[PDB]
DNA sequence: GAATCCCCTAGCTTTAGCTATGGGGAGTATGTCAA
DNA sequence: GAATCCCCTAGCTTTAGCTATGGGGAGTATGTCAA
């Protein structure tokens, strides 16, 4: 992980060659510090199952009590929202079934929002000038 | 500095370096065809709330750096930019219509980019732990 | 082979000509070779 | 105010609880304050 190359390695679906990495962040309802202990270990396991099913590659994932950071490699045609929607939605249903305190003390496990930031190997300014200098 | 945008439910910054080429990689993206291609895409971007950070053509392919709402989808912008530009350019420059079955191909190249490079973003996550 | 060539459906915009984590295929053809 | 709180429809997955370039709102209440 610490020595994982950040150099691009493209992949493709039937019509698109791509490399789309997203930094996704979301928090529990009311920003409660519920992602600890067992809840945390299960959350990551669940999201990993979702990733495998959705052909999404979790490059990095760390939970930190009242929020979670994921760095995912997703097919842009598939849609980062499909991954997020499934990871959050399934993790909610399951974690709330497995951990009664999350079902009784919160109307929902997550909020309706999330933070999404795309990332690449190169910084935005490098790409911008590269495009700018096409001719 | 990164200016994050937001729809009703998502705070975001999704920037993509999009590239596609004319059918048979013909070097038709020049002159008036090139100028119109850029205008049409600008129109589409404004209508689709897509910010076009940078956009340059190079005879047989077009590069676009755009910020697109994740929920909306990058493929929707790409579909609209290619589909519409094909329809309009083919009506405006008859040769694009007579010598090619389509203006574009079914493929494209897409890569994400952020203000911060991957190593820095990994470092932040690592550090906040 | 595939992104790129040929062919297909279904869904949508541009009602033509493009997507879909969409499918099938080969041989100088109505036909490409790489950003 | 908003992403985050409250409220709503409706689309899809997990059939509950998340979305949608989705919409409406205000003030201790079922009720948050930032990664
Ligand atoms: Mn195909
Ligand atoms: Mn809302
Ligand atoms: Mn180029």
The span from the CA of A70 to the CA of A81, in Å, is 13
Chain B residues 48-77 with a CB less than 8 Å from chain A: 53-58, 63-65, 70-71, 73-75
Size (chain A), residues: 135
Resolution reading in Å: 2.4
Residues 6+ apart with CB under 8 A from B84: B40, B44
Biggest CA–CA distance in chain B, Å, is 60
CATH of the domain at A69: 3.30.70.1290
Residue A41: how many CA atoms within 13 Å on its side-chain side? Answer: 4
Size (chain B), residues: 129
Q: How was this structure determined?
A: X-ray
- Residue B124: active-site member: yes
Residues 6+ apart with CB under 8 A from A37: none
The number of beta carbons lying within 10 Å of the beta carbon of residue A83 is 24
Nearest alpha-carbon partner for A67 in A105, A2, A114, A119: A114
Per the annotation, does B43 bind a ligand? Answer: no
Residues paired with residue B12 on neighbouring β-strands, in sequence order: A116, B5
Q: What is the 3-state secondary structure (H, E, C) of chain B?
A: CCCCEECCCEEEECEEEEEECEHHHCCCECHHHHHHHHHHHHHHHHHCCCEEEEEEECECCEEEEEECCCCCCHHHHHHHHHHHHHHHHHHHCHHHHHCCCCCECCCEEEEEEECCCHHHHHHHHHHCC
As a whole number of Å, the end-to-end CA separation of chain B is 24
Residue A127: C-alpha distances to residues A114, A121, B54, B63 (Å) = 26, 10, 9, 10
Question: Strand B62-67 and strand A114-119: pairing?
Answer: unpaired
Range of the domain at B31: 1-129
Residues paired with residue A61 on neighbouring β-strands, in sequence order: A70
How many domains in chain A?
Answer: 1
Closest residue in A to B7 (Cα) is A113
What sign does the dihedral A120-B123-B69-A125 (CA atoms) show?
Answer: negative
Nucleotides of strand C lying closer than 7 angstroms to a protein CB: 2-8, 11-23, 31-35
Residues 6+ apart with CB under 8 A from A102: A34, A39, A95, A96, A109
Residues 6+ apart with CB under 8 A from B103: B22, B23, B28, B82, B85, B86, B89, B90, B96
């Amino acid at each position: 992980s610490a020595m994982a190359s950040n150099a691009v390695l493209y992949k493709s679906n039937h019509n698109v060659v791509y490399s789309c990495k997203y930094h996704i962040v979301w928090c529990p309802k009311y920003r409660r510090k519920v992602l600890v202990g067992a809840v945390e270990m299960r959350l990551k396991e669940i999201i990993q199952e979702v990733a495998k099913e959705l052909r999404v590659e979790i490059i990095e994932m760390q939970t930190d009590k009242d929020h979670i950071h994921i760095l995912a490699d997703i097919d842009p045609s598939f849609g980062v929202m499909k991954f997020i929607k499934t990871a959050k939605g399934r993790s909610s249903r399951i974690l709330r079934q497995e951990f009664n305190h999350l079902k009784t003390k919160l109307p929902t496990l997550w909020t309706n929002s999330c933070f999404i930031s795309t990332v690449g190997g190169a910084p935005l300014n490098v790409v911008k000038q590269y495009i700018e200098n096409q001719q």
